[PDB]
Symmetry: C5
Subunit: 23 residues, 5 copies
């Protein structure tokens, strides 16, 4: 399984992608 840390970093990456897309 991926680590909790990898999953959280993936979420963070995705949230920043979404910020950049909506700006």
């Amino acid at each position: 399984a991926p680590t909790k840390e990898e999953v959280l970093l993936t979420e963070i990456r995705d949230l920043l992608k979404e910020q950049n897309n909506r700006s």
Copy 2:
């Protein structure tokens, strides 16, 4: 033999807070 569900890493707790802040920021708009 050690704990099966030990406390998460300090890294994990901080990344959680960072995640929460970015998500809340997004949720404002």
Copy 3:
């Protein structure tokens, strides 16, 4: 006072700074 934890890792310090910056920006925006 609460006990002072063992010395934080460089990772922890940087992540805490990042958290602080995001909190600051959320608060003033």
Copy 4:
């Protein structure tokens, strides 16, 4: 260089995204 860790790859992408934001703001 040796293969990057999964965390390094993600942090690099996060860096890249923030740099893009900086350039675009």
Copy 5:
């Protein structure tokens, strides 16, 4: 005592966020 790649990246991320806050 060389920095780790993780440290190098987190330092840049921190600096970019400081810049964002300053320019906002």
